[PDB]
Amino acid sequence: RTRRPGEPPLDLGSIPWLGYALDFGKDAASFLTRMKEKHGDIFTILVGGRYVTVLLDPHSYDAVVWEPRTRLDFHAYAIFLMERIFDVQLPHYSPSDEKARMKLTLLHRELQALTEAMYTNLHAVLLGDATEAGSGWHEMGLLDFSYSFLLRAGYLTLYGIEALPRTHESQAQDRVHSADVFHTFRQLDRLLPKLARGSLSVGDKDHMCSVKSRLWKLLSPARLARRAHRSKWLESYLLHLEEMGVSEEMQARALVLQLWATQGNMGPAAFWLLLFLLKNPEALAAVRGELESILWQLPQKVLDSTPVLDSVLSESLRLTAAPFITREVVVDLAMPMADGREFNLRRGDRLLLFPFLSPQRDPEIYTDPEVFKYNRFLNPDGSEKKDFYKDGKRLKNYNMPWGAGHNHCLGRSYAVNSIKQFVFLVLVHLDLELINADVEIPEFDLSRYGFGLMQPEHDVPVRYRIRPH
Ligand code: HEM
Ligand SMILES: CCCCCCCCO[C@@H]1O[C@H](CO)[C@@H](O)[C@H](O)[C@H]1O
Ligand SMILES: Nc1cc(N2CCCCC2)nc(N)[n+]1[O-]
């Protein structure tokens, strides 16, 4: 490939066809940071036979993310995930249509219904497990801890419970069942990045197929039909699939895709948040102080009146949420930059924006971006800090864990509420400690850049107990 007039800087690397496939795959953030240093805020790279133009000027993001599908296609990842990763085939499939239908089931009123059920399920699973284990300290990995309880509760909230009214045995059954779902799901979640790259070994392939087969059985419509207090989201989705004449077996596959889609981020998000608090005594004291003040007067103020916790969650996501925002270039076109520049992109190129690098870890926007500063999103007077700058201009987009434009989180309020509820339960109802107070924060699994929340390369040992009194 030879650069044409008005195109971004072009960097093909050394290896024919593959280009920077290895570098990008191994550690996308480090690789792209170097490319930014070399080329500036926009550049084109060869990666695995594809030409990818990377845009890293956060002021220029807004234009891109709202472009019509006639210019920049925002359906490609959804199709790839549905058909190529989760093995789902739907008739007349349109990601926009599916998204619009889901929105209608996730309006403010319904998200508030989910929030109420979520607290009940978080409480039931957390205190249920803790009660079964008994009053002592119990040792666990913090990710296993956070991901298990959030996913199990999220599953019970969206997909329903064993019985209503709730009984001792039905709740116990949901603890065992949800644990099975989680343990099976985690095997898929660990293998997903390798599946996406097509790098599974013969043995890995058999493992993934076995896990998929089990999950498809567990979340079959026949199994789900008997469950109580199913979410409107689920009921509507099932009705939609039925109306399209989708088989119950294919519905199962679609439902497993949704399990990963909706539950693959909250647990990891909470893991990092709790870890940051445990490693930063002042931050932890501020959060506990805020929550205890509310307790002394789920108390509704925990959701609507936790300014310190809001900053903490924003700060944790700033450091750890790393989704790619991608588009396929549909036609040869000119893309405007915020500074007045214009760059030509070619039909068939991929466009990649990476908020993790900028704005989120941009040292011109945030002072010491690598550091967890619990009050980064607080003004001195305690009000929310919303004013961040780059290149002499106020940023519209400064922290983007929920996406932007056409592809943004439809469950944000519920996701935020769920994480807050979990943190409240853990910090107020439990004692929670690092085994080693001096343990260093683990590196990311660097191969997972682009999906959403990062996961740690290894877990962090903690211990918890029910608060003695
Ligand atoms: C911390 C947790 C979460 C984060 C950071 C997050 C972030 C995101 C992002 C970045 C997208 C855009 C995806 C893309 O098109 O590339 C998205 C989409 C979406 N999210 Fe979330 N999300 C979270 C949790 C949830 C939860 C708990 C729900 C509901 C239970 C939810 C519902 C949705 C829906 C329905 C979409 C649109 C899917 C589609 O395009 O068909 N999210 N989210
Ligand atoms: C790299 C995995 C993180 C998710 C990125 C979502 C946007 C593109 O998703 C996929 O990425 C693959 C590898 O780059 C490409 O080969 C596929 O064509 C593309 O659909
Ligand atoms: N982060 C994501 C991603 C996601 N996807 C659905 C399929 C298309 C892009 C990824 N769905 C949901 N619910 N969340 O929360």
Swiss-Prot record:
Cofactor names from the entry are: heme
Q: Where in the cell is it found?
A: Endoplasmic reticulum membrane
- Give me the disulphide-bonded residues: none
Q: List the CDD domains.
A: PGIS_CYP8A1
Q: Which GO terms fall under molecular function for this chain's record?
A: heme binding; hydroperoxy icosatetraenoate dehydratase activity; iron ion binding; monooxygenase activity; oxidoreductase activity, acting on paired donors, with incorporation or reduction of molecular oxygen; prostaglandin-I synthase activity
Expression (tissue specificity) = Widely expressed; particularly abundant in ovary, heart, skeletal muscle, lung and prostate.
Q: Which Gene3D superfamilies match?
A: Cytochrome P450
Annotated positions binding heme: C409
Cellular component, GO, one term: caveola
- Pfam families (alphabetical): p450
What EC designation does it have? 5.3.99.4, 4.2.1.152
Keyword terms? Endoplasmic reticulum, Fatty acid biosynthesis, Fatty acid metabolism, Heme, Iron, Isomerase, Lipid biosynthesis, Lipid metabolism, Lyase, Membrane, Metal-binding, Prostaglandin biosynthesis, Prostaglandin metabolism, Transmembrane, Transmembrane helix
Q: Provide the protein name.
A: Prostacyclin synthase
Gene transcribed to yield this protein: PTGIS
